[PDB]
Structure 1
């Protein structure tokens, strides 16, 4: 059993831009979600070997997690805030598609997503 390589977090050819919106996504959004009691399943790429989920990467073809987002924000990977917001939305959607309603992991993702959406609604103006 094998995990895929993680999503890209370093690419010297990709143009980068530090924006006040991206700064908010790191210092407010990511740091708040990271400390949440339900953050732990989402703090690193899904380890389908360790978690005995051998079909995970057969079903989920755009994996994303907050460990990768944290690296992308701290290492200035992005050009705009929308790219980072899409990463969070992908992470949540993966969990909803792979698991079933009623699963504890889905209740955890739903709690984090409610927090995320509240914070995104207060994304500062550029």
Structure 2
């Protein structure tokens, strides 16, 4: 667990989690409960903040760049599946802005 990775866990994930718009990204999209029976055929690599958080907490990542790619996948999946004025896209967009600002302050490995 590099210090960039502990920053992803202690700073990026924590800051995003507390956001009022973050909760649709806490858990995998459940295509049955939400009646999106095409979701897994369009979105081949599902990702969510809960899975990212678990991977950080259990030292799954080899580098912070893998963690960031999961974040990038999470947001991009949202945009792939949804429409530009959907509430979910506005929520993703607000979260993504904070994400970009927070990883800009990520410390260097030393």
Identify the TM-score tier after normalising by the shorter chain. over 0.9
Answer with 1 or 2: which has the greater Rg: 1
Shifted more, 21-30 versus 31-40: the winner is 31-40
Which TM-score applies when normalising by structure 2? 0.97
Task: From the two aligned structures, give the one with the greater helix fraction.
Answer: 2
Partner of 1:76: helix, strand, or coil?
coil
What is the CA–CA distance in structure 2 between the aligned matches of 1:66 and 1:50, rounded to whole Å?
A: 19
- Residue 35 of structure 1: CA displacement? 1.1
Runs in 1 of length 4+ with deviation above 4 angstroms? Answer: none
How big is the alpha-carbon RMSD for the aligned residues of Structure 1 and Structure 2?
Answer: 0.5
2:26 corresponds in structure 1 to: 43
- From 59, 70, 82, the counterpart of 2:53: 70
Gaps of 5+ in 2: none
Which TM-score applies when normalising by structure 1? 0.85
Partner of 1:73: helix, strand, or coil?
helix
